[PDB]
Amino acid sequence: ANHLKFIARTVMVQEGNVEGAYRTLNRILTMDGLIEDIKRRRYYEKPCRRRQRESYETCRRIYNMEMARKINFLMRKNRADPWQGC
Amino acid sequence: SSFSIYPPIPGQENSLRWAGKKFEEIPIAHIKASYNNTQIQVVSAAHQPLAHASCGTEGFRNAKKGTGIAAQTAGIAAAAKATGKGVTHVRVVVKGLGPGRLSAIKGLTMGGLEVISITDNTPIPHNGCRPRKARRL
Amino acid sequence: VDYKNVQLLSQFISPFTGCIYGRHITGLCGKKQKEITKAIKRAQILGFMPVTYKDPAYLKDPKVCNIKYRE
Amino acid sequence: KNILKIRRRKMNHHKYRKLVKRT
Amino acid sequence: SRYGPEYKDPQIDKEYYRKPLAEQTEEEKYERDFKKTQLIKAAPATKTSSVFEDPVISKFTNMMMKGGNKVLARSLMTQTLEAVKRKQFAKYHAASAEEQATIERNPYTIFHQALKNCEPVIGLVPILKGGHFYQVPVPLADRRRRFLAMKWMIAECREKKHRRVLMPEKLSQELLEAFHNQGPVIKRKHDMHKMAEANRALAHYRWW
Amino acid sequence: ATPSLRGRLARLGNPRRPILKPNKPLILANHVGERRREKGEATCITEMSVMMACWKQNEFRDEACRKEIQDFFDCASRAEAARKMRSIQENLGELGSLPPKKLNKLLHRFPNKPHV
Amino acid sequence: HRFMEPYLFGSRLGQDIIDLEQTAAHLQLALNFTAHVAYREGIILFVSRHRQFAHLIETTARDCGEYAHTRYFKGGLLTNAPLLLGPGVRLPDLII
RNA sequence: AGAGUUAAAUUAUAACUAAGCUGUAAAAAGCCCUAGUUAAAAUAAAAUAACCCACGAAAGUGACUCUAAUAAUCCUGACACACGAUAGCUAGGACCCAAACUGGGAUUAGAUACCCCACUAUGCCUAGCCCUAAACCCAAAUAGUUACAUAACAAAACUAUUCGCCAGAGUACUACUCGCAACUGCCUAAAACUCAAAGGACUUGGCGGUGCUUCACAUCCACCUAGAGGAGCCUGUUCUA
Ligand SMILES: [Mg+2]
Ligand SMILES: [Mg+2]
Numbered sequence A: 001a002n003h004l005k006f007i008a009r010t011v012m013v014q015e016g017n018v019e020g021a022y023r024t025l026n027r028i029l030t031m032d033g034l035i036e037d038i039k040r041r042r043y044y045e046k047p048c049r050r051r052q053r054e055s056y057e058t059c060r061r062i063y064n065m066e067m068a069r070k071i072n073f074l075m076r077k078n079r080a081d082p083w084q085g086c
Numbered sequence B: 001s002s003f004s005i006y007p008p009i010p011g012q013e014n015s016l017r018w019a020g021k022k023f024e025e026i027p028i029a030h031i032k033a034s035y036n037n038t039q040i041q042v043v044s045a046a047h048q049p050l051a052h053a054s055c056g057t058e059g060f061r062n063a064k065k066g067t068g069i070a071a072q073t074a075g076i077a078a079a080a081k082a083t084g085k086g087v088t089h090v091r092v093v094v095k096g097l098g099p100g101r102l103s104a105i106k107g108l109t110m111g112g113l114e115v116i117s118i119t120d121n122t123p124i125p126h127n128g129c130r131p132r133k134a135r136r137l
Numbered sequence C: 001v002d003y004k005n006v007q008l009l010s011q012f013i014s015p016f017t018g019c020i021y022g023r024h025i026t027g028l029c030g031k032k033q034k035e036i037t038k039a040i041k042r043a044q045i046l047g048f049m050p051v052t053y054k055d056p057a058y059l060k061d062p063k064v065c066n067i068k069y070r071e
Numbered sequence D: 001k002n003i004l005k006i007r008r009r010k011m012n013h014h015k016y017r018k019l020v021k022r023t
Numbered sequence E: 001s002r003y004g005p006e007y008k009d010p011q012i013d014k015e016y017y018r019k020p021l022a023e024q025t026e027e028e029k030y031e032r033d034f035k036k037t038q039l040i041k042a043a044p045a046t047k048t049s050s051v052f053e054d055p056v057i058s059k060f061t062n063m064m065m066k067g068g069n070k071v072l073a074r075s076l077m078t079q080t081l082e083a084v085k086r087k088q089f090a091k092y093h094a095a096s097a098e099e100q101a102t103i104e105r106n107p108y109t110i111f112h113q114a115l116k117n118c119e120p121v122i123g124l125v126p127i128l129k130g131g132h133f134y135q136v137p138v139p140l141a142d143r144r145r146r147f148l149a150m151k152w153m154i155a156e157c158r159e160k161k162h163r164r165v166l167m168p169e170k171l172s173q174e175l176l177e178a179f180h181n182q183g184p185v186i187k188r189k190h191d192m193h194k195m196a197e198a199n200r201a202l203a204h205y206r207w208w
Numbered sequence F: 001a002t003p004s005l006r007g008r009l010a011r012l013g014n015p016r017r018p019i020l021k022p023n024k025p026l027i028l029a030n031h032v033g034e035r036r037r038e039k040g041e042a043t044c045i046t047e048m049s050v051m052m053a054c055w056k057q058n059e060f061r062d063e064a065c066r067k068e069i070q071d072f073f074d075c076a077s078r079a080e081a082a083r084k085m086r087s088i089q090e091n092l093g094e095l096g097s098l099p100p101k102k103l104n105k106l107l108h109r110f111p112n113k114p115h116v
Numbered sequence G: 001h002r003f004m005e006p007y008l009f010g011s012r013l014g015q016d017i018i019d020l021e022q023t024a025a026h027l028q029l030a031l032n033f034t035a036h037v038a039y040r041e042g043i044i045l046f047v048s049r050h051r052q053f054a055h056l057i058e059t060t061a062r063d064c065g066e067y068a069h070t071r072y073f074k075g076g077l078l079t080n081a082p083l084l085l086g087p088g089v090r091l092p093d094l095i096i
Numbered sequence H: 001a002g003a004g005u006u007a008a009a010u011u012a013u014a015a016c017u018a019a020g021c022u023g024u025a026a027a028a029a030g031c032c033c034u035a036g037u038u039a040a041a042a043u044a045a046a047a048u049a050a051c052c053c054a055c056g057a058a059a060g061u062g063a064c065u066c067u068a069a070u071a072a073u074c075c076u077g078a079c080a081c082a083c084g085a086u087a088g089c090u091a092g093g094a095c096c097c098a099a100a101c102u103g104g105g106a107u108u109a110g111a112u113a114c115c116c117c118a119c120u121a122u123g124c125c126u127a128g129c130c131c132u133a134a135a136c137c138c139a140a141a142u143a144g145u146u147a148c149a150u151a152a153c154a155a156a157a158c159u160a161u162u163c164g165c166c167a168g169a170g171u172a173c174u175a176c177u178c179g180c181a182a183c184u185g186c187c188u189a190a191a192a193c194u195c196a197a198a199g200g201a202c203u204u205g206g207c208g209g210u211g212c213u214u215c216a217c218a219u220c221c222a223c224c225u226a227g228a229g230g231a232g233c234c235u236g237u238u239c240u241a
């Protein structure tokens, strides 16, 4: 509002394909959480409720992170087995 | 071909024109896309309104005007009324998160109007006024 | 880290939004991530550095952070 | 499970508050 | 299903078997057909090698048939084709050289064209949402559309004729009226199209 | 890098106050979850709307606009072909990853030890 | 594993180095025992479930005139012997 | 704890432009002194950083700046002393926005609810009260050990020094007392009587208007064909007889 206009959350379209520009914008906003934030501010969410969410999210993230880590570590051993029909 | 996603700052020497105008001189298409309705207003760079079209203006009624189709129809209409007053290129400003966002944009293109830049200015409070309570107690 | 140089600060901001990046992006000792945050907010209110967007001048400086928007 | 205990107290208290209003 | 899934449908076309030597992939294909020691369902009584049979005419014949009467329905079809024919021969000799160049006398091409004109583009499916049944615009498969055409024809020329009036008469009438797009059948098609525009917003409820 | 687990959970030894309250214990399971099937949305809606405009304008005579009819048809064909052919390849190829069956087997070959 | 620490000579850069003096001490004893069981005409059963050496071990056993189980070990094989193997059976006198 | 300050929103208020705007699973009611854009004080609340885990005795504290500042040469300890979320009370000031209550609109058999719109007490500041919370990390403070050792579940098992508590379930966060700026209050806290259980954790079922996958092949929806439900008869039920 007091900032200069058009410098922010702005994407310029290339070779006239708009769908792509918009996609890029939406990716920018998804990445910075602006989208989730917008969506979550439609209604209010009482502090305890928010505390609970943050905690659940962080648990969830820890688990996904670690499972992923174990996948990428175990990934080598998916290769065809040498010892078949031993 | 060097193509910057970032717009052309005013103080810069930067030379790009669309029909001979600077990036600053191009008209602005404001689009407010809200959950029950989508409104569009094309305006001069100098902020004189050229054209206005909304899903209500387009003769949909209560729930139907929520949908994407409606939004697109408003887009086309807006662009017609706009090209009448002779605006070839327009910079989109999308305000709000709704069912009609993308649709009203590509309706602006469908309706024979050229979109150069598409900006999102959605109110994001940094915590001002408390929004209304949640649904289903 | 000094609130007075907006250049260094403006490195750890998102160009489009003006958000401050997390550790998992900037990759800083907790100490510095903190110093950076505090310095940023200080700058923003003393009127050195813009809040909602990364100042366009500093767009082409070196990119330290791990985020990729355009794919 | 435990709520059965709580529920009981809950009821008691309600009924009593009600009564203080009448009485 | 007195045929196991092993049994392939027969290919009745004579032209396919008569002139093989110019196509590689198809030679390979029917080579694999018979040489697979593949079982073939016995060719049905309806279908023939006849140079004269139109599968669309036969379908229509069937949809007209009540009970078990092919003889009667094939009668009514035959009579209807003959009736369109003679109606156009009547319209030909009372006309002038220009209109004698214009007017179509092939009852087959008339049948086909009259069905192509009467087939709907878009359609409606009921969808339950929030305890209400909304009618929603649905794109249709080809077969569904042809079906809708034929069924609408027959339903009208069964239902709306005066009891004195015979079937091949009314049917030839409606075939010729649908040839020129002014038939009541076509009005039905339009009622659908208009109901589909009235509801176009609801096109979002469709999830597929 | 994984978020820190030190000091987070409520335990007899921990000096401070809980940060996480996990709903179910944080122990890597020996299988992964099954991929969530994509929510469908309506297809061809744009071409439909264009055709409907063409009709409203030309008074619903089909002869008038053959292009939008034909293109709406073309599109519905591409949505049928899409529904048929995408199901199988989305159900097999995960791109850089493995089908959840193979992942589960791989994870049973090198399981987590909660016990001992 | 916790119970192994007495047998570790130590840990070199993260690897655990078993103490060979003790390995020799023990191995002498195991071999001694094995041998005396063999001399006394008793059944020896080599057991491993590791699929590299499975063939190697099955081979080895067949060459000593001793038995090998290298495969999946059925549930009640030792405890419920007479059902899995047969009506009356001898069970291994030693298992390696 | 003070004092000072404000970026993003939001709003009084004008200026253009448009007839609608708002609102839902869908509507209605409301508003058109409305809506979009451009300008904007006050008030209130503090995106991102935070995938951090710091400060405080606890309650609590995460916009910015400065001033003052975080007891004990560190054992336990009250009914004494000083604090103590939200709500609430008194008085004065504020009021963007939210909102018990209430009034409208739907919904429903009803709807004194859930859903929609308006608006109030109240949420804010100053001063004083009130002293309660699932004030729960349901895990007392201070030193320690990882020895012995699995009821179950949960956050593994234990020593020493202390203090506070607990003797079936109801009755009962009740009745009577004492004290208290509390006067529909807090605190303290019985008995008659009634029962032969009340509780805790688990197990297998069954169920679930719970979620995720996969299906239905005359089969639920989509769809196809012929019928029934209306007529006369035929024949069977129920009634009445
Ligand atoms: Mg509640
Ligand atoms: Mg009671």
Ligand SMILES: [Mg+2]
Pocket (backbone or CB within 6 Å): none
């Ligand atoms: Mg502490």
Ligand SMILES: [Mg+2]
Pocket (backbone or CB within 6 Å): F023
């Ligand atoms: Mg739990």
Ligand SMILES: [Mg+2]
Pocket (backbone or CB within 6 Å): none
């Ligand atoms: Mg401001």
Ligand SMILES: [Mg+2]
Pocket (backbone or CB within 6 Å): H012
């Ligand atoms: Mg005011």
Ligand SMILES: [Mg+2]
Pocket (backbone or CB within 6 Å): none
């Ligand atoms: Mg009204």
Ligand SMILES: [Mg+2]
Pocket (backbone or CB within 6 Å): B126, B127, H046, H063
């Ligand atoms: Mg803030």
Ligand SMILES: [Mg+2]
Pocket (backbone or CB within 6 Å): none
């Ligand atoms: Mg201290």
Ligand SMILES: [Mg+2]
Pocket (backbone or CB within 6 Å): none
């Ligand atoms: Mg003390």
Ligand SMILES: [Mg+2]
Pocket (backbone or CB within 6 Å): none
């Ligand atoms: Mg208090």
Ligand SMILES: [Mg+2]
Pocket (backbone or CB within 6 Å): none
């Ligand atoms: Mg108060």
Ligand SMILES: [Mg+2]
Pocket (backbone or CB within 6 Å): none
């Ligand atoms: Mg007051």
Ligand SMILES: [Mg+2]
Pocket (backbone or CB within 6 Å): none
């Ligand atoms: Mg008020």
Ligand SMILES: [Mg+2]
Pocket (backbone or CB within 6 Å): B132
């Ligand atoms: Mg309100």
Ligand SMILES: [Mg+2]
Pocket (backbone or CB within 6 Å): none
């Ligand atoms: Mg009411």
Ligand SMILES: [Mg+2]
Pocket (backbone or CB within 6 Å): none
């Ligand atoms: Mg004060």
Ligand SMILES: [Mg+2]
Pocket (backbone or CB within 6 Å): none
């Ligand atoms: Mg608390």
